[PDB]
Amino acid sequence: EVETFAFQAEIAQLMSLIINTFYSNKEIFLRELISNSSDALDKIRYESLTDPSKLDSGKELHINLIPNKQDRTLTIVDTGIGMTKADLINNLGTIAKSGTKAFMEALQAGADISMIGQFGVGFYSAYLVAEKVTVITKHNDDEQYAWESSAGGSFTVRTDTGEPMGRGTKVILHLKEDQTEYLEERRIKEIVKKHSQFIGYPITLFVE
């Protein structure tokens, strides 16, 4: 059913720095996530050029932003490449151990938390605004899995029995209570325009 894993020591540290350092520019999480979505879409697009059947699990290449004021979640959905079970457990396909080290050194030489994406670890910036992150992913080579973590050093992975998704990743951010500004339509729009204005895939902002 549910497997529980410990994060490697450098990720646990990376997540704790993110959660504990006072840093008011939290809004960069969205860009970091849309930027992961865009890389994952590049990937399925490049593979499909030589094997069109990779798009049998969906032809449309895009990003959806889904706010839900009742559940208090912001969900970032793409129909990108997805992750296999092994890649989800291996730091969601990131080079988190070496990127974190390098990032921490840059933080001592004048870098700041907004540069997290330059180190291949921007996914973890979700924890600037989220108390819990769930990630649902479907790779063409595998079943559908849910990853989840509220930090504190562990994450869980299970087969996902929610609704089948064709292919891609949904990052579901359960927001901290003081961060609900990220569920507001004109907030999200503003942030997309400031940091992700020109991206190679269409972004749809869902309304409620």
Encoded tokens for 87: 């890649």
Which residue among 67, 80, 99, 120 contacts ligand ZZ3 (CB under 6 A)?
Answer: 80
- Do the Cβ atoms of 116 and 122 come closer than 8 Å? yes
Task: For residue 61, state whether it binds ligand ZZ3 (rule: CB under 6 A).
Answer: no
Residue 201 sits in the site that holds ligand ZZ3 (CB under 6 A): no
Residue ranges of the annotated binding site for ATP are: 36, 78, 97, 123
> For ligand ZZ3, which stretch binds (CB under 6 A), given 48-56, 76-84, 109-117, 190-198?
76-84
Question: Which stretch of DSSP H or E encloses residue 131?
Answer: strand 130-138
Q: Minimum Å distance from CB 98 to ligand ZZ3? A: 16
Name residue 64's beta-bridge partners.
Answer: 77, 204
**What is d(CA 161, CA 146) in angstroms, rounded to the nearest whole number?**
9
Q: Does 83 bind ligand ZZ3 (CB under 6 A)?
A: yes
With CB under 6 A as the contact rule, the residue among 28, 40, 136, 191 that binds ligand ZZ3 is 40
Q: Which two tokens stand for residue 109?
A: 């030489």
